[PDB]
């Protein structure tokens, strides 16, 4: 049960199943994708160990 | 809120003999004796003085309706000594 804009944006980040993750570089086109899926994800700025 | 200490002191004359065992205060004076218990109250009825000439009632950590009890026990031991000293005597008239 998922709204048809969000299925398209989660596809484009290749997150197609639960508890899956990806690297993503940042800019304006990259954040405003991540405000449309911002109750299906968790993201943050990773370190040299993570 | 929870008021830390509360107390009051009753003091006997040159006439009467009182003591206790827990909170069950006995009294004998010039015309009888009387036992009254108070074992339903949570207090410290400590006696003090040489020739035991004052009772004293504490009540640590209390809310509103248990600092009430302090003076009501303080004024039940008043009607035990005033009845054993002088003694009680109601009167009444027949009406028609």
């Amino acid at each position: 049960g998922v709204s048809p804009k969000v299925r398209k944006v989660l596809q484009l980040l290749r997150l197609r199943q639960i508890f899956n993750g990806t690297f993503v570089k940042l800019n304006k086109a990259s954040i405003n994708m991540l405000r449309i899926v911002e109750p299906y994800i968790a993201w943050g700025y990773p370190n040299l160990k993570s | 809120m929870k008021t830390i200490l509360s107390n009051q002191t009753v003091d006997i004359p040159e006439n009467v003999d009182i003591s206790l065992k827990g909170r069950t205060v006995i009294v004998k004076g010039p015309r009888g004796t009387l036992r009254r218990d108070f074992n339903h109250i949570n207090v410290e009825l400590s006696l003090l003085g040489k020739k035991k000439k004052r009772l004293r009632v504490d009540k640590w950590w209390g809310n509103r309706k248990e600092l009430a009890t302090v003076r009501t026990i303080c004024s039940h031991v008043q009607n035990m000594i005033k009845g054993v000293t002088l003694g009680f005597r109601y009167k009444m008239r027949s009406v028609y």
Partner: protein
């Protein structure tokens, strides 16, 4: 907001990005209270957006280093000021405590307003945390501990540790 753990106390100064119309725009500093830095900067964007014309598409944060107590052994009467939202309106306030940390007071507070008013920490602000003196204090409860030679006994010591035998020979004691 959730008021989890204890609250830290934070300094988070936050100006706006210098647009070219006049070279330098003003800085604006605030004591926030929060358990981590993520809710010490995004909750700070709810208080500054109401005073100035300042949301988040133009707006940076310069500092967010934790502030510490500096008499964290000493007892202190705090005088905290409150604002809160009822079901039927809105209210301002003054509200006192005792602790050893500016932070700890605020925390104590969000737990009292939970108890006497069924207010949840998103209907609740601290407008002015302020340390206060002894004879100045107004309210009854916190006054009575202004007694140097304090002498109270711990009377009816309700017993803890009740599944340590589980069954036993002795009925317990409760006066120590």
């Amino acid at each position: 907001m959730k008021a989890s753990g204890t609250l830290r106390e934070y300094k988070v100064v936050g100006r706006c990005l210098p647009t070219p119309k006049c070279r330098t725009p003003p800085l604006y500093r605030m004591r926030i209270f929060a358990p981590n830095h993520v809710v010490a900067k995004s909750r700070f964007w709810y208080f500054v957006s109401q005073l100035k014309k300042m949301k988040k598409s133009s707006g940076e944060i310069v500092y967010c280093g934790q502030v510490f107590e500096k008499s964290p052994l000493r007892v202190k009467n705090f005088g905290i000021w409150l604002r809160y939202d009822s079901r039927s309106g809105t209210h301002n306030m003054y509200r006192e405590y005792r602790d050893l940390t500016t932070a700890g007071a605020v925390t104590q507070c969000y737990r009292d307003m939970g108890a006497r008013h069924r207010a949840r920490a998103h209907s609740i602000q601290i407008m002015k945390v302020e340390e206060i003196a002894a004879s100045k204090c107004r309210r009854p409860a916190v006054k009575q501990f202004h007694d140097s030679k304090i002498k109270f006994p711990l009377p009816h010591r309700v017993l803890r540790r009740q599944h340590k035998p589980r069954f036993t020979t002795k009925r317990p004691n409760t006066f120590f």
